[PDB]
Design a protein around this ligand. Sequence first.
Ligand SMILES: *[C@@H]1O[C@H](CO)[C@@H](O[C@@H]2O[C@H](CO)[C@@H](O[C@@H]3O[C@H](CO)[C@@H](O)[C@H](O)[C@@H]3O)[C@H](O)[C@H]2NC(C)=O)[C@H](O)[C@H]1NC(C)=O
Ligand SMILES: *[C@@H]1O[C@H](CO)[C@@H](O)[C@H](O)[C@H]1NC(C)=O
Ligand SMILES: *[C@@H]1O[C@H](CO)[C@@H](O)[C@H](O)[C@H]1NC(C)=O
Ligand SMILES: *[C@@H]1O[C@H](CO)[C@@H](O)[C@H](O)[C@H]1NC(C)=O
Lengths: 413, 413
Amino acid sequence: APDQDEIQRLPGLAKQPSFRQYSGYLKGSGSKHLHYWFVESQKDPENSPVVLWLNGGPGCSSLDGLLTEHGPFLVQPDGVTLEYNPYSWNLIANVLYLESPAGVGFSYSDDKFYATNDTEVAQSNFEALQDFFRLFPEYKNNKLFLTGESYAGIYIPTLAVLVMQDPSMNLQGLAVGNGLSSYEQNDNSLVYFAYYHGLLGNRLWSSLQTHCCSQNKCNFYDNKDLECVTNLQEVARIVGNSGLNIYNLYAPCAGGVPRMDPPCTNTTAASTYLNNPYVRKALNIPEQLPQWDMCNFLVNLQYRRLYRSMNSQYLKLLSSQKYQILLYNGDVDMACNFMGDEWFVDSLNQKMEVQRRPWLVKYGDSGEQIAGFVKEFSHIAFLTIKGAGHMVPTDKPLAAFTMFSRFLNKQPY
Amino acid sequence: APDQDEIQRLPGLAKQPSFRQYSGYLKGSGSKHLHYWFVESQKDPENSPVVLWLNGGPGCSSLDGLLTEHGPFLVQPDGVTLEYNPYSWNLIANVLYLESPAGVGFSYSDDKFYATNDTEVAQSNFEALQDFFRLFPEYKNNKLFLTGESYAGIYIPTLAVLVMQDPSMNLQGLAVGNGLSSYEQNDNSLVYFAYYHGLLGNRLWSSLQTHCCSQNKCNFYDNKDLECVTNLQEVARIVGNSGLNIYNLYAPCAGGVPRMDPPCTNTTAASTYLNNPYVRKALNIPEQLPQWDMCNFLVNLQYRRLYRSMNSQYLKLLSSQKYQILLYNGDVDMACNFMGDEWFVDSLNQKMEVQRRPWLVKYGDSGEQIAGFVKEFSHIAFLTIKGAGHMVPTDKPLAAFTMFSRFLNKQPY
Ligand SMILES: *[C@@H]1O[C@H](CO)[C@@H](O[C@@H]2O[C@H](CO)[C@@H](O[C@@H]3O[C@H](CO)[C@@H](O)[C@H](O)[C@@H]3O)[C@H](O)[C@H]2NC(C)=O)[C@H](O)[C@H]1NC(C)=O
Ligand SMILES: *[C@@H]1O[C@H](CO)[C@@H](O)[C@H](O)[C@H]1NC(C)=O
Ligand SMILES: *[C@@H]1O[C@H](CO)[C@@H](O)[C@H](O)[C@H]1NC(C)=O
Ligand SMILES: *[C@@H]1O[C@H](CO)[C@@H](O)[C@H](O)[C@H]1NC(C)=O
């Protein structure tokens, strides 16, 4: 452990943490330096696993994960106070929140050139993970899981493949929340999603069927029919550009119906907090670096997407059969809808183990409830979180914790 | 107005109502006596319309409507306290909550034979509505709307037809909330609903398609294929009999995962309240009558369903073109899912007026949001309430009030 990176007194806590936590920089490729925030397991660091958490974007910060999803403490609406999180993932794991790629959040490079792409980011994370274990050698033995959300449906499998090549790293599994596993399935499934969740109506549905579909299959992905395109554009407008919350259809859109924030998302609370000069100091952030933003428009705008589907990577990770994989999805998200990923998993053709069923969670007073549905294969499970959006741990923390706990512990969901 | 039916001091109110309200009995057919509860418009009774509200079941009470949906005051969880409702429908209307048919709630008959059927109940309500105006002649001029929910998708159109025959009654429109308009469309649409809301998965979806569907038109209604039936039974088990809240999919099922209550519904609050001997007294209920239940198992179990579709009744009501009709649906309800009714309306073939679009509601701080979608035809509109279940005014009161206000006032939604 690099002592100088230790986080001493973090502004906004009434009482200091019982666990150690570090914040500093990991070397990536070239002259890139990725900011990390490592929170030790609240229960036996030396025998709790090592979890990498990557938010997606591309261009968005993994400190959103920490501060608004499943970190030990969550920033409150005043931008100043942090409250402990009883459902935090670092209850049972050493969680490494990594701001990536270069330029996102407090991460930078010496040359400041932040145009990048999937292969480069994969390599960058891989090398940063390498640099991590040089700095934290006492965690080289620990079980190592790679987890992410959103565009990290690309970051994570591509990374995992590189990790798979290095047996010094003790990779045991990976989990992806509302991930982007396949643009084609995402896009085709979203359109059904839109109709059957009441956003489209029958004239438009008919048109779509007529122009984009022939008898038992639709192409809403790359269809060249010009009348299909005009309708897909209408769907794109309804879903993404007309007032709905694409991250969570049944939630209000932050700041009425019409720097890069994610859409329908208020990022004030976290930004206010992390730009506090005392917070930057506590987190060993060098002063000269620009303000923190949840996402970087430059990164996102300059980003080159190469992989169109994670089918290879997953089969390549499944062939070995050393690795326990989970894809989970909020079933009211339209950014990466649950069905797209259910189709994606189903189309991996693995040996079915447990048939598709409910899975439960115990609540105070409410008793046991259905948290979602789960379909298991050997080494790979798909699972939904009923009534949760793009950011599962925010919409349903307890369910998210249960899922995660049962994942870490090789247990049935 | 029958003075003796006036409600004087209602237990559980801190301060007494600014409006008059009456509770007593209307004569139906034979020796049947229906309990009513009439709440005068809070704003100019003499020029506010007359709204009949019927809950469905069959066998369930319209006092649920009052006490848990859109009455001037709602019973609170202690079963004792009533709190005023700022979104109450009697803000702008004279709302007549009618317990029907005979045997439901405080309604009875001298002979106590409560087996009945759609045609008899229709006639019974019609005659009770007649008896109403004998008792309340000063309201014969007022605009008269027939509104209901649930199985009242049958009660209301069938009733309306009888009302349509009597020009002494000033019928102006009717509205049905998550109504049962057509068993066939309800049943076929529910199955799609189930799949695309993540309850079914692909093996079961495939089977269903295979056995229940040829060439992309499905029969999930009355299909005789024995392999189809085995799967429809599975669907029935998942949707209705496995822990989900059929009234609202994203809500927990009251009292964990397993007298006729509705399923997944706690009826304690209201029952506790209405069985209070002092409440019965305040509401002029004769003592000898049995306890109040939100639904009557006898009625429901002995009920004979005759109409299989309200297509006739609605065209018959539309032909005249004196009548303004609204079907609205909570888009997370599985008892009477929104699509079934959207299909039902679309298949009425009326002259399209306004194309399908969003409709908005202003919230405190949140600004304008999308409350749902609306598709208007000549004299008949279909409209959804996003994120609302079977009981719209409970899940989304403000949106429900807005909708209703805009309905009453012949205004665009
Ligand atoms: C995704 O980005 C990576 C990293 O930038 C790209 O790989 C890099 O490709 C560039 C040019 O496209 C190479 O630049 C060369 O540098 C070497 C230095 O020895 C020199 O021989 C040339 O003069 C040139 O400047 C760079 O070597 C190369 N890096 C790696 C690790 O392969 C990759 O091509 C991008 N992929 C796509 C599809 O755009
Ligand atoms: C965003 O959050 C900040 C503080 O958390 C608050 O002051 C502001 O009003 C919020 N904006 C919206 C649209 O909720
Ligand atoms: C039903 O409601 C009552 C009164 O609100 C409450 O005390 C009780 O916990 C509820 N019962 C169940 C089984 O949830
Ligand atoms: C419905 O009820 C009425 C009144 O009791 C009765 O005359 C009629 O025969 C019933 N209809 C059917 C189909 O049984």
